Amino acid sequence: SHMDLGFKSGIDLLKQRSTVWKLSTSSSELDSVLGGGLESQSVTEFAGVFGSGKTQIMHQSCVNLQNPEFLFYDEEAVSKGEVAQPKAVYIDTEGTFRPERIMQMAEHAGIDGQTVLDNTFVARAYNSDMQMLFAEKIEDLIQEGNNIKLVVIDSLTSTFRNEYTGRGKLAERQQKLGRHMATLNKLADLFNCVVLVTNQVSAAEQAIGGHIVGHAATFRFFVRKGKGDKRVAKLYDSPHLPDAEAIFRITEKGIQD
Amino acid sequence: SHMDLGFKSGIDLLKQRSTVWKLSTSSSELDSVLGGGLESQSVTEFAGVFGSGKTQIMHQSCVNLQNPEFLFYDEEAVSKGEVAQPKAVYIDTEGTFRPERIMQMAEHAGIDGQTVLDNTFVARAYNSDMQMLFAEKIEDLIQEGNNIKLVVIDSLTSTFRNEYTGRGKLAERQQKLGRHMATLNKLADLFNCVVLVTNQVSAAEQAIGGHIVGHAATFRFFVRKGKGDKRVAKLYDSPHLPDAEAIFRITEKGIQD
Amino acid sequence: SHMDLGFKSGIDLLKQRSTVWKLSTSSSELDSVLGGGLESQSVTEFAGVFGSGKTQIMHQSCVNLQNPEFLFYDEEAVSKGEVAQPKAVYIDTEGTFRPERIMQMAEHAGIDGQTVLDNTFVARAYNSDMQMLFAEKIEDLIQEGNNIKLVVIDSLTSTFRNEYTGRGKLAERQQKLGRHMATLNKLADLFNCVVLVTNQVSAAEQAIGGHIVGHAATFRFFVRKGKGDKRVAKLYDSPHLPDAEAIFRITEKGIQD
Amino acid sequence: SHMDLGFKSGIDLLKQRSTVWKLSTSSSELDSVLGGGLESQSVTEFAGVFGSGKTQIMHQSCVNLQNPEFLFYDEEAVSKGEVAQPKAVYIDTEGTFRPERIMQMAEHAGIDGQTVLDNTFVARAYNSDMQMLFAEKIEDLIQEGNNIKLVVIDSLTSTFRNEYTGRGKLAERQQKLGRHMATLNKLADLFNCVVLVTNQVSAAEQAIGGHIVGHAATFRFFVRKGKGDKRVAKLYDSPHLPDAEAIFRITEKGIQD
Amino acid sequence: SHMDLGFKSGIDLLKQRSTVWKLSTSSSELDSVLGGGLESQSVTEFAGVFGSGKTQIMHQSCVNLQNPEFLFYDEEAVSKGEVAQPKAVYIDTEGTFRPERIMQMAEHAGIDGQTVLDNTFVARAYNSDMQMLFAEKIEDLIQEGNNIKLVVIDSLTSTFRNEYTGRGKLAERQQKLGRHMATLNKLADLFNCVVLVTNQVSAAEQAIGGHIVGHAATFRFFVRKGKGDKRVAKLYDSPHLPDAEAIFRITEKGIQD
Amino acid sequence: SHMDLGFKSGIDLLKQRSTVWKLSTSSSELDSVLGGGLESQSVTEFAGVFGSGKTQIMHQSCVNLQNPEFLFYDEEAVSKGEVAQPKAVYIDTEGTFRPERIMQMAEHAGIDGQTVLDNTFVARAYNSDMQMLFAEKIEDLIQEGNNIKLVVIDSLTSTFRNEYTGRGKLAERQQKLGRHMATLNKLADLFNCVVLVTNQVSAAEQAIGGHIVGHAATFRFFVRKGKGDKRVAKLYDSPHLPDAEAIFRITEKGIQD
DSSP, X not given: OOGGGTOEEHHHHHHHHHTOOEEOOSOHHHHHHHTSSEETTEEEEEEESTTSSHHHHHHHHHHHHTOGGGEEOOTTTSXXXXXXXXXXXXXXXXSOOOHHHHHHHHHHHTSOHHHHHHHEEEEEOOSHHHHHXXXXXXXXXXXXXXXXXXXXXXXXXXXXXXXXXXXXXXXXXXXXXXXXXXXXXXHHHHTTOEEEEEEOEEOOOEETTHHHHHTTOSEEEEEEEOSTTEEEEEEEEOSSOOOOEEEXXXXXXXXXX | OHHHHTOEEHHHHHHHTTSOOEEOOSOHXXXXXXXXXXXXXXXXXXXXXXXXXXXXXXXXXXXXXXXXXGEEOOTTTSOTTTTSSOEXXXXXXXXXXXXXXXXXXXXXXXXXXXXXXXXXXXXEOSSHHHHHHHHHHHHHHHHTTOOEEEEEEEOSSHHHHHHOOSGGGHHHHHHHHHHHHHHHHHHHHHTTOEEEEEEOEEOOOEETTHHHHHHHOSEEEEEEEOSTTEEEEEEEEOSSSOOEEEEEEXXXXXXXX | OOTTTSOEEHHXXXXXXXXXXXXXXXXXXXXXXXXXXXXXXXXXXXXXXXXXXXXXXXXXXXXXXXOGGGEEOOTTTSOTTTXXXXXXXXXXXXSOOOHHHHHHHHHTTTOOHHHHHHTEEEEEOSSHHHHHHHHHHHHHHHHTTOEEEEEEEEOSSHHHHHHOOSTTXXXXXXXXXXXXXXXXXXXXXXXXXXEEEEEOEEOOOEETTHHHHHTTOSEEEEEEEOSTTEEEEEXXXXXXXXXXXXXXXXXXXXXXX | XXXXXXXXXXXXXXXXXXXXXXXXXXXXXXXXXXXXXXXXXXXXXXXXXXXXXXXXXXHHHHHHTXXXXXXXXXXXXXXXXXXXXXXXXXXXXXXXXXXXXXXXXXXXXXXXXXXXXXXXXXXXXXXXXXXXXXXXXXXXXXXXXXXXEEEEEEOSSHHHHHHSOSSSSHHHHHHHHHHHHHHHHHHHHHXXXXXXXXXXXXXXXXXXXXXXXXXXXSEEEEEEEOSTTEEEEEEEEOSSSOOEEEEEEEOSSSEEO | OOTTTTOEEHHHXXXXXXXXXXXXXXXXXXXXXXXXXXXXXXXXXXXXXXXXXHHHHHHHHHHHHTOGGGEEOOTTTSOTTTSSSOEEEEEESSXXXXXXXXXXXXXXXXXXXXXXXXXXXXXXXXXXXXXXXXXXXXXXXXXXXXXXXXXXXXXXXXXXXXXXXXXXXXXXXXXXXXXXXXXXXXXXXXXXXXXXXXXXXXXXXXETTTHHHHHTOSEEEEEEEOSTTEEEEEEEEOSSSOOEEEEEEXXXXXXXX | OOTTTTOEEHHHHHHHTTSOOEEOOSOHHXXXXXXXXXXXXXXXXXXXXXXXXXXXXXXXXXXXXXXXXXXXXOTTTSOTTTTSSEEEEEEESSSOOOHHHXXXXXXXXXXXXXXXXXXXXXXXXXXXXXXXXXHHTHHHXXXXXXXXXXXXXXXXXXXXXXXXXXXXXXXXXXXXXXHHHHHHHHHHHHTTOEEEEEEOEEOOOEETTTHHHHTTOSEEEEEEEOSTTEEEEEXXXXXSSOOEEEEEEEETTEXXX
């Protein structure tokens, strides 16, 4: 089998494309910009400054998973069992995971919170090896009979850049990063799930990790803080989709409008 | 299963959160700021200059453990047994451990100094390898069946900053540190003990080990010197507790007020 | 035998030369320039800026493979058996493989888009380990009875230059490149097939990879953006051919003129 | 036990403390600054310039170990067999060991010069590996039936400053030092004996090795040259001893007054 | 034996001295300078800019090898059946090996070129590793029964200098070169054959590789361009012979005068 | 026992000192300055510029080993067995070994030149790996039952300083040197033989290798040119001898006066 070696026919590609599902962000304009919601079989980067709502979209996504109405798919190309009792893995790199906030967004979504918490796996990663190693251990979690359908890496680069300071080591960091990006892409594809990552920015404008990361994300956003609680999502890279801006808000309800 | 892999569910996170218990520091103001006292299942950092009292708080924590009335827990949540015959580990990195100082504190506190001394295991560490390894051997100490309910690391970073001078190997250092922070956090959580780390500062305001240490510690204090024997501990990082200041004294009685 | 180590005798080189075939690029001039077209047992490089058509030629190439009329060979020395069910492999470095563009190219040239997508393997590589390893796996695709006659490496250098930003680790880069470059040649030469690499450029005039690449590339082009949709391809290094330019276009038909 | 894991109870520490013995230096003023003599279970450092006595003290000690009256201890806590047939190890790093000088010192202290040579082991180390490896090999030397009670390391740092010259690989050095200081300490403790190290000085007024060494040396002197054959030794680190200066002389007899 | 260890007696040296044969370069003047021709059991180096004829000499030697007359030995030291059916190995570093030139040179030699191509193994190398390995694998070519009497390395340092650039891993390069030079000398010696190497020149008048290469090559020339097709060869380093210049030409014959 | 681990008692050192024998240099002044001749059990270094006579002494030494008038020892301490059919090893670093010069020196001293070549083993080293391996391998030659009594390293540092050129990879050079100096010191001591090394100099006035070498060689000479053929060795380091200058000549006879 060629599929076995990591190769895919032009046709395999066309086939695997049918079984993409999309997860709603609780946001009309944001959903619209993505063409329905966040895709399975892709890595999606949300980049921006502390407070731009990256961690928030992450937590919203874990609640939204526990609501089958928020998962859009072709009923013909994807079985209901594919998306059955779906679960999420949340790799927490800086301690951003808020159980309460899960509860809160759930309550407002009418989803049971207790239920979300029970279907969300949380891996507290204190350094890049742990981070990488956790992403790998997702195969084992699936193979434990856990239908992992959502993967969150929050954040993607925090550890790497706390570890590699001083340009005398970039090339290892860039190489680990590429490994990690590879794994992330691996499990989006071969377990048909959505893979979301949060990232930071810098000057004179870019998301951390240079091209290694950019080339390896399918969909890339910037998140800017608009007035008060409104936010803007700038989609600037997409496999086919056009480049657009979604405004939305983060309130006590969670993500809205 | 998933536990074996390092993953916890949201619901396990709340289930954890009921069995947390608390150790008094013998200062009312410091216990107050702490929300009752030093918490288990968290790493607690005391940063500040030589002579600011960090070693004193580590010692007092060893004395206070051997006093059932100094551990605050939920009777309906934490078995009377899980917290009985409590032992501390004191990984001593610059030779700060004074048994004479233990005596003094226990006497004054009305505790048997002898008892204290007998349930405080001291591990003298001359370098980061020894320091890091002793911490992992805590797992082994509890396998033998010792109720380790307190882990001291005094100090957290002295070895690392003596082993790494000049930007040469700085990336290894930063990861070695992250690896050490994981073990510390791992053993606070898994064994429901309190973990205290002392650290130094540098300018114009920070604790050594950068953010790699920072994100890894759940409570963080800077300890300042007041006049004479008074000191001020400044909680500036905690999950759900307000940034407050706590004044106290260091006397022949140990930590008081 | 000496038919096992890596030494091809002089005579073996001549007997080697007998079995070379050619694949039309769909331009008259470009073909002309090439001694007839893209040689098997050789590596061919298209270097130039983004949008210069490098990728297009790769695609055009995959399409053209499934059309025995576009494959010129020795009737008497290349047994017509050996060129049948010809499959292509396309190692894709930054997500350039457009399956639809394969449809397009196919139609406007009267080929089964379906046959082409069916006989094109696509290895998505997120880093240079994956890229090199995909390349080594072509031995194994063949071992499972796939008549791989076309290899595409698009890009040749995008992963390397992303991993070795910061020229402390340049030597391992260069060596890694070299090692890959061997593979590419070995498998052109031992499995009688054509290997195409695309490359990017720099300044004041050179193709990325320097000389390690240059010395291992047998045919070498610069691709310049002429007016609007026309393009020129400058052949600068070849075994025995004249140095010359070639114009053609890129349209919805594909590579033309 | 915990005892074998590297952990000592606070009671074990008190226990251990009863079995520390002392070793006279042959100078009254020096002994008194040491509060008896060179202590077992501790590392002692003499640091000063070439010619300031350091090596003389090592020699003098090798002699004095074979005068059983020069050993001070608690006959209640240390048995006569623990200090019986006492052998010294002399790790010679630059060629400082003078058998002649050993004879000489002994003839004058009424010790049999021959007995001394016969029970002083000498390891000639040309480099840091050899030096460290010999220190570790003291285990096997004892595990062979040799009551090693005195270990000389003269010099402590000469090999390292000759191997790592000007910053760059400073870290491997600083950790190799740490590993060595670990070993020296361990065998002082586990085999209840005296470890003495010689060291040089630098710019100001500090001993080579920085803090890795300082934090790991229990007692630390600077030895200055007074006039002619007189010297002064400055105690400036000790757990419970007053910092103080001892004057003494070096003569045909060895250390004296 | 001691031969097995790589040790030779002074008498073994003289005995080897006997079995040395020499290969003509078709240059009278070159030949004479060499004291007869290229020596076996030595490494001969041709250093010069591109176009100076190193490759010409290399090729010519491959042909002259195939010419019974052209190999001068001693019949009272060496048997006709050790110089019989000789073969050459030719390591190609930049793809300089032109089998057509082989043919041409050979036709003009009154020797069949086809024969030469059959008695000439060519290893195409794209980097240091492959380069080194092929030269190792020559041992094995003598094992399958091949009478390898001529080893060509063209170029000696092109790969290395394409890999190691700057001051980064210059030491890693110099040691690699050394290992390489060991191998070449070893097989020159132990399989009594002639080893030739080509090299580039740099800035201020030296062959690339420095002393590592120079100390390790018995015979060294600086080949310069004279007027037109005339070339001059400066022997500057040799065992016993004086430093001399020899003029010659490169033509349709190959090397002449 | 302790000789196994590398420990020598003080009395074993005294014993050692008795089996010490000495080899004449053929120079009166030189011999006188050495207190009789080059010593077994010691490493003697000759350092100086090219042409200073280093190699010449090496060669003289290989000759004088074959003339038993030229070996001085205690017949009571050293049985005539130990020094019978002695042999010598010459590790040759830059092709300095001259059988013809061995012959010549030997004729003039009335020794059979053939005899000297037959008991002189010659290792040609092209890099420090070989250099070091060679030296280690002398054990094996002794095991095969060759009475190795003379080890020459001509030269000590040529490889190392050729291989290293870049201040960060200097620390391995130094440790590698130290490792080898250890080997040389080992084998002088273990096999009661003389070990000679030649070294080049730098400026302002030092021999290459620094103190890593200086501390590991017992006897040390700076050899300078006089007028014409006269030469002057300056002994500047020796355990028990005064610094002194010895003048001699180098001629077709060899070393003389």
